[PDB]
Write a protein that holds these residues in place. Structure first.
Motif, mmCIF file in Angstrom:
data_model
loop_
_atom_site.group_PDB
_atom_site.id
_atom_site.type_symbol
_atom_site.label_atom_id
_atom_site.label_comp_id
_atom_site.label_asym_id
_atom_site.label_seq_id
_atom_site.Cartn_x
_atom_site.Cartn_y
_atom_site.Cartn_z
ATOM 1 N N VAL B 1 -24.546 95.681 -6.370
ATOM 2 C CA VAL B 1 -25.650 95.152 -5.654
ATOM 3 C C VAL B 1 -26.322 96.262 -4.854
ATOM 4 O O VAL B 1 -25.662 96.946 -4.107
ATOM 5 C CB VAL B 1 -25.283 93.960 -4.792
ATOM 6 C CG1 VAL B 1 -24.377 94.287 -3.656
ATOM 7 C CG2 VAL B 1 -26.567 93.380 -4.185
ATOM 8 N N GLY B 2 -27.653 96.401 -5.040
ATOM 9 C CA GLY B 2 -28.336 97.516 -4.376
ATOM 10 C C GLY B 2 -29.590 97.851 -5.176
ATOM 11 O O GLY B 2 -30.294 96.946 -5.638
ATOM 12 N N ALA B 3 -29.869 99.117 -5.304
ATOM 13 C CA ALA B 3 -31.120 99.610 -5.915
ATOM 14 C C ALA B 3 -30.849 100.259 -7.246
ATOM 15 O O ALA B 3 -29.852 100.937 -7.411
ATOM 16 C CB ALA B 3 -31.826 100.625 -4.978
#
Ligand SMILES: [Cl-]
Ligand SMILES: [Cl-]
Ligand SMILES: [Cl-]
Ligand SMILES: [Cl-]
Ligand SMILES: [Cl-]
Ligand SMILES: [Rb+]
Ligand SMILES: [Rb+]
Ligand SMILES: [Rb+]
Ligand SMILES: [Rb+]
Lengths: 16, 16
Positions: B1-3
Motif C-alpha cells: 500500500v502506497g505509491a
C-alpha cells in the motif's frame, strides 16, 4: 470510463 | 500500500 485521471488501474496511490 | 503502479487513485484506466 476510460483513460485519464481518477480511480482504477495505473499509477498513483493505493494498492500494489 | 502506497505509491507506484497497481490500483487506486491517479493516472491510467477506470473512472473519472
Ligand atoms: Cl509513498
Ligand atoms: Cl512505474
Ligand atoms: Cl488488479
Ligand atoms: Cl474495460
Ligand atoms: Cl468518476
Ligand atoms: Rb487510476
Ligand atoms: Rb491509478
Ligand atoms: Rb499504487
Ligand atoms: Rb477516466
Amino acid at each position: 470510463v476510460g483513460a485519464x485521471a481518477x480511480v482504477x488501474w495505473x499509477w498513483x496511490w493505493x494498492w500494489x
